[PDB]
Design a protein around this ligand. Structure first.
Ligand SMILES: *[C@@H]1O[C@H](CO)[C@@H](O[C@@H]2O[C@H](CO)[C@@H](O[C@@H]3O[C@H](CO)[C@@H](O)[C@H](O)[C@@H]3O)[C@H](O)[C@H]2NC(C)=O)[C@H](O)[C@H]1NC(C)=O
Ligand SMILES: *[C@@H]1O[C@H](CO)[C@@H](O[C@@H]2O[C@H](CO)[C@@H](O)[C@H](O)[C@H]2NC(C)=O)[C@H](O)[C@H]1NC(C)=O
Ligand SMILES: *[C@@H]1O[C@H](CO)[C@@H](O)[C@H](O)[C@H]1NC(C)=O
Ligand SMILES: *[C@@H]1O[C@H](CO)[C@@H](O)[C@H](O)[C@H]1NC(C)=O
Length: 525
């Protein structure tokens, strides 16, 4: 970024530059490269001998600059072109500067020689130029920049020296260079003026942007002479609850539905399932009411809840020993840390208040924290009634203000299994089904709850069998082959347990033709 301390082409009416001697430089109206009409200076005392012609600019405010740049546009007539020119002819001019705190210059001060002044360089027409048409004849306009520093006083003058040439100084622009305010690696680096030396790299310190915090230190950026910042050093990062936006220029609060817990430039991630943001810019998602997240739980994981009760409690009692199996709860709470607890309630044979179970009762594998849906129960009071409660508990249960969901079974020791079921008859049949029924076993020995039926193809074996559960003593079996003989065995279930499978009974589906006859009679639908 360049800041102009003086521009000769902004001259409204006339530049006030001092000419010494007046014999030399003269001010003349001219054109710029775009043919806009400006003020220029010229000197062509080529034949005259021993010429030292000086042109001094007005006072120029430094305005805090450190290295000053002077850009010069000009044209020179080549001494070859001038007929019968002496060897005094030159195609160069010299640039000088004088530093001062106040515009105290006269026609005699400072002295018009090299030393009160300071030489920048000898300027010549060298390969950097443009060509502009004027009225069919083209003019060559050279542009040359020079720089000088350090500069310390409030201002300075520039001086131009001719020593016997034909030249036209068209424009002079004086400027310094600054580096603009920038945001890099999360930091605001403020305006920095370029340094005095040509190769200067000036250092500036970064401060974190808005809702951001320093992460890697130190935070530094460097400004070069051409007005450009270099590669950054250090880093600021958007703090928790804030995400980097607008090519890293702002750190913005996390939008609703999103959270961020640790510092970073990354973007906020959505609240896990069954969680929500109380507000914007959230460091955490609050779990849904009745739902909790556990310690040691990944925070990407959804909020979870307690499991429901176990179901399908099936009990088989062998004398004082017992076996309880079941199937897992309908709702597992979203967790895989689900385990079962068994609580025992020894109770009177009648409606007397239940008592605590004995110390002697043995639980294999254990009373609590069961992994499989089954418990094998050892020594227990014989001919005694009891209630067993199997509760389901998962890894978030300890946060629940409610008691665990459980399943209950009332059962009595040394109770007899139902007798084997007598016989079964085929009620109806189709090509793919067999509907059949059987009699209640003659000696239930308790209340019967459900039945079990096992079927397999006669050509195949019990190895290939299937088993199903029947709430009543009649049921349909579907999916069978056409005209095939199937072997059926049935078993009853009381709280005490299962009976013995009945004798293998042999039924058969309709063949395809028999089913054709049946449906043909049934016509129409
Ligand atoms: C009904 O159940 C029986 C027994 O479970 C099944 O028979 C078994 O079928 C498998 C292939 O499905 C047989 O394994 C095969 O063994 C031969 C060598 O004999 C080998 O070349 C094959 O790559 C394959 O490993 C197995 O031997 C056989 N077992 C018996 C005792 O026969 C039968 O597939 C089941 N059918 C249905 C419809 O479910
Ligand atoms: C399992 O046994 C318990 C024994 O405590 C039974 O509990 C009683 O249930 C009746 C049901 O109306 C209540 O009126 C009683 O107050 C309960 N307490 C007692 C001490 O008897 C329970 O009903 C039995 N469950 C089944 C399905 O038989
Ligand atoms: C961010 O960078 C992309 C790069 O293609 C540019 O198109 C966009 O204008 C930049 N936005 C801002 C605010 O600088
Ligand atoms: C019950 O357990 C005994 C061992 O204590 C075992 O011999 C018997 O086969 C089991 N089953 C029945 C129905 O008794």
């Amino acid at each position: 970024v360049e800041e102009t301390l003086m521009d000769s082409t902004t001259a409204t009416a006339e530049l006030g530059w001092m000419v010494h001697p007046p014999s030399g430089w003269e001010e003349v109206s001219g054109y710029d490269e775009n043919m806009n009409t400006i003020r220029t200076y010229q000197v062509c005392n080529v034949f005259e001998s021993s010429q030292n012609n000086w042109l001094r600019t007005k006072f120029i405010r430094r305005r805090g600059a450190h290295r000053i740049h002077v850009e010069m546009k000009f044209s020179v007539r080549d001494c070859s072109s001038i007929p019968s020119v002496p060897g005094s002819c030159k195609e160069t001019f010299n640039l000088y500067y004088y530093e001062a705190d106040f515009d105290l210059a006269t026609k005699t001060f400072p002295n018009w020689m090299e030393n009160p002044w300071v030489k920048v360089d000898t300027i010549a027409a060298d390969e950097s130029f443009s060509q502009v048409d004027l009225g069919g004849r083209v003019m060559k306009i050279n542009t040359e920049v020079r720089s000088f520093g350090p500069v310390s006083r409030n201002g300075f003058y520039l001086a131009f020296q001719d020593y016997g040439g034909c030249m036209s100084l068209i424009a002079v622009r004086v400027f310094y260079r600054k580096c603009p305010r920038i945001i890099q690696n999360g930091a605001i680096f403020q305006e920095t003026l370029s340094g005095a030396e040509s190769t200067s790299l000036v250092a500036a310190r970064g401060s974190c942007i808005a809702n951001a915090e320093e992460v890697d230190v130190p935070i530094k950026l460097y400004c070069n002479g051409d007005g450009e910042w270099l590669v950054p050093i250090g880093r600021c990062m958007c703090k928790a609850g804030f995400e980097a936006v607008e090519n890293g220029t702002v750190c913005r609060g996390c939008p609703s539905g999103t959270f961020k817990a640790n510092q970073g430039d990354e973007a906020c991630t959505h609240c896990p399932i069954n969680s929500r943001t109380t507000s914007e810019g959230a460091t955490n998602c609050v779990c849904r009411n009745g739902y909790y997240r556990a310690d040691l739980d990944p925070l990407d994981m959804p909020c979870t809840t307690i499991p429901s009760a176990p179901q399908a409690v099936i009990s088989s009692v062998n004398e004082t020993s017992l076996m309880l199996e079941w199937t897992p709860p309908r709702d597992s709470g979203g967790r895989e840390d689900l385990v079962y607890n068994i609580i025992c309630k020894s109770c009177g044979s009648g409606r007397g208040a239940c008592t605590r179970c004995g110390d002697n009762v043995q639980y294999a594998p254990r009373q609590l924290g069961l992994t499989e849906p089954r418990i094998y129960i050892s020594d227990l009071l014989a001919h005694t009634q009891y209630t067993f409660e199997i509760q389901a508990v998962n890894g978030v249960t300890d946060q629940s203000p409610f008691s665990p969901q459980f399943a209950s079974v009332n059962i009595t020791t040394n109770q007899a299994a139902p007798s084997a079921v007598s016989i079964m008859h085929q009620v109806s049949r189709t090509v793919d089904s067999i509907t059949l029924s059987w009699s209640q076993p003659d000696q239930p020995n308790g209340v019967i709850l459900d039945y079990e039926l096992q079927y397999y193809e006669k050509e195949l074996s019990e190895y290939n069998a299937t088993a199903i559960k029947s709430p009543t003593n009649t049921v349909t079996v579907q999916g069978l082959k056409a005209g095939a003989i199937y072997v059926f065995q049935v078993r009853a279930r009381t709280v005490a347990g299962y009976g013995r499978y009945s004798g293998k009974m042999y039924f058969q589906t309709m063949t395809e033709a028999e089913y054709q006859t049946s449906i043909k009679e049934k016509l129409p639908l």
